[PDB]
C-alpha cells in the first residue's frame, strides 16, 4: 500500500570517536592461547 | 606513498 | 504439424515452423484450435533450451508480433510464471522482452508499451521486498537500464513512460517503494528528451540537481544511502558533465555533515562503500585531498563493518597513490587501534604496512632500522604483525630477518619473551616446508 509513513531517523551531528593521548604494557599469555 | 621511512 | 514439434520437443521443428512464418499466420486468432496451439506455445515458453536459442528469441518476437490480443494472456502467463524460473533465466527472459520491443513497430507496438513494461516497472516499485519475484524485476529492469545506453531513442520512450510514473515516485512517502524508486532513479540519471531546446535541457538538469538534493535530504537513513550510492555513480561517470559550481556545493554538502551522522554508522558505511570508486577522478585529486584529513576521527568508531570498509580505502589510496597516508592519520592513534582491532581488521592493517615495516629489496640495515623500532616504540603490535606476515608472505622472508637478527636487553621478561616469539615463528614456517 503507497504513501506509508515509517520511523524515519533524522541526521544528527557528533562524535563517535574518542581520541585518548595516554602517553605524550603488554601481556603474552592471553595471545598465547 | 608506501613507506613511512 | 506443431502437434509433433511439441510432443517430441525438438527445436528444428519449431524453427521449420519459423520459416513458414505466413503458413502459420493463416491460422484466425478466433479458432479454439489456435487457441490450443498457443497454449502449446506456452509450453514453448516452459521449455528452456528454446530461450537459450537464438532463434527462440525470434519466434517468440514473432509471436508477439502475431496477435495483439493474444499479448495480454502472455502478461498473464508470464505474470503466473515468474516464480518458477531462476535468476539466469530471468536475465534471458528480459532480453527476449528487450528483442520483442525492437522487432516490434506500429500500434502493437504501442499497446505493448501501454501494457507491458509499465505494469511490470509499477509492480516492482509496489512489489514487498520480501517477495523473491520482486528481486527479479528490478534486475531485470537494471538490465533494461543497462540496455538503454546500446540503442539510441531507448532513453526517449522511457522518458515518456516515465513522464507520468517517475515523479510522485520521488515524493511516495512510504519509504521502501520510494527507496525502490530511487533504486530505478540513480541509474535512470540523466534522462533526455530529444525535441526540447537548450533552455528545457538547463531546466531538466536543474530539476535532476534539485531532485537528488531533496532525495539526498530525505530524512530515512536508508534511502539516504542509496542516495549517497547514486551521487557517487553519477560523479564517478559524468563529473566532467556537471557544473563545477554544483559539483563543489554537493561536495561540500556530502563531506561536511554526512561523515557524522551519529543516527546510524552503515550510512557512513555507505560513504565509505562510495569512496573507491569516485577516486578515479584524475582532475578533483586536490579537491578531494583538501577534505582527506577530515576523516581522521573515524577510526575510532565502534561500528566493525565501517572500520573494515576504512581500511579497504587505505589499501585503495595506497594502490593508487593519491595522498601520502600518514599526512592523513597519525601512526601512533593506528598502532593503538591495534592494540584494540580485531583479526581481518589487523589483517588489512598488516597488508597496509607492510611497506612500512618489512622491506624486501632495502638491505640489513634498513630492515634493523625499522627492525630496532617495531621492536621498541611498541610491542603488542609487532607480535600481530609477526603473526600476520607468514600467512601474508613466505616463510624464506621470516628465515631471512631471523639470520639477520640472530647475526629492551634491561629486561629479562623482554628476551625471554623474544626468545618465545622466535619459538612461534620457528612453530609457524616449519609447517610450510
Redesign the interface.
Known amino acids: 500500500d503507497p504513501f506509508d509513513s515509517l520511523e524515519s531517523k533524522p541526521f544528527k551531528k557528533g562524535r563517535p570517536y574518542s581520541v585518548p593521548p595516554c602517553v605524550e604494557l603488554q601481556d603474552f599469555h592471553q595471545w598465547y592461547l | 606513498?608506501?613507506?613511512?621511512? | 504439424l506443431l502437434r509433433r514439434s511439441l510432443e517430441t520437443k525438438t527445436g528444428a521443428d519449431v524453427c521449420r515452423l519459423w520459416r513458414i512464418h505466413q503458413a502459420l499466420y493463416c491460422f484466425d486468432y478466433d479458432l479454439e484450435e489456435s487457441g490450443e496451439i498457443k497454449d502449446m506455445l506456452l509450453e514453448c515458453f516452459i521449455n528452456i533450451n528454446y530461450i537459450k536459442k537464438e532463434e527462440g528469441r525470434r519466434f517468440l518476437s514473432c509471436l508477439f508480433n502475431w496477435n495483439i490480443n493474444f499479448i495480454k494472456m502472455i502478461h498473464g502467463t508470464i505474470k503466473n510464471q515468474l516464480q518458477g524460473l531462476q535468476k539466469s533465466l530471468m536475465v534471458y527472459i528480459a532480453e527476449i522482452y528487450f528483442r520483442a520491443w525492437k522487432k516490434a513497430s506500429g500500434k502493437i507496438l504501442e499497446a505493448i508499451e501501454n501494457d507491458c513494461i509499465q505494469d511490470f516497472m509499477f509492480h516492482g516499485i509496489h512489489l514487498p521486498r520480501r517477495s523473491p519475484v520482486h528481486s527479479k524485476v528490478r534486475e531485470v529492469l537494471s538490465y533494461f537500464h543497462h540496455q538503454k545506453k546500446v540503442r539510441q531513442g531507448v532513453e526517449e520512450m522511457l522518458y515518456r513512460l516515465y513522464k507520468p510514473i517517475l515523479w510522485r515516485g520521488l515524493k511516495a512517502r512510504n519509504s521502501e517503494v520510494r527507496s525502490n524508486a530511487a533504486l530505478l532513479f540513480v541509474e535512470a540519471f540523466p534522462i533526455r528528451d530529444p525535441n526540447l531546446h537548450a533552455i528545457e535541457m538547463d531546466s531538466e538538469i536543474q530539476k535532476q540537481f534539485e531532485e537528488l538534493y531533496s532525495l539526498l535530504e530525505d530524512p530515512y537513513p536508508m534511502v539516504r544511502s542509496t542516495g549517497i550510492l547514486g551521487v557517487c555513480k553519477i560523479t564517478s561517470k559524468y563529473w566532467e558533465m556537471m557544473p563545477p559550481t554544483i559539483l563543489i556545493d554537493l561536495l561540500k554538502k556530502v563531506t561536511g555533515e554526512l561523515a557524522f551522522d551519529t543516527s546510524s554508522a552503515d550510512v557512513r558505511c555507505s560513504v565509505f562503500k562510495c569512496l573507491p570508486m569516485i577516486l578515479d577522478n584524475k582532475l578533483s585529486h586536490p579537491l578531494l585531498e583538501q577534505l582527506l584529513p577530515a576523516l581522521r576521527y573515524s577510526l575510532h568508531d565502534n561500528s566493525e563493518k565501517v572500520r573494515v570498509a576504512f581500511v579497504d580505502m587505505l589499501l585503495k589510496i595506497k594502490a593508487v597513490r593519491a595522498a601520502k597516508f600518514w599526512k592523513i592519520c597519525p601512526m601512533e592513534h593506528i598502532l593503538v587501534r591495534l592494540e584494540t582491532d580485531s583479526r581481518p581488521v589487523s589483517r588489512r592493517l598488516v597488508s597496509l604496512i607492510f611497506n612500512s615495516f618489512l622491506p624486501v629489496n632495502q638491505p640489513e640495515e634498513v630492515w634493523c632500522e625499522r627492525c630496532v623500532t617495531l621492536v621498541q616504540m611498541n610491542h603488542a603490535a609487532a607480535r600481530r604483525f609477526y603473526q600476520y606476515a607468514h600467512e601474508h608472505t613466505a616463510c624464506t622472508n621470516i628465515a631471512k630477518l631471523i639470520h639477520v637478527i640472530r647475526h629492551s636487553v634491561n629486561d629479562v621478561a623482554c628476551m625471554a619473551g623474544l626468545l618465545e616469539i622466535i619459538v612461534i615463528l620457528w612453530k609457524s614456517i616449519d609447517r610450510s616446508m
Not at chain 2, 1 to 5: A, K, M, Q, S, T
Request: hydrophobic share 40%; aromatic share 40%.
Open positions: 606513498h608506501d613507506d613511512f621511512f
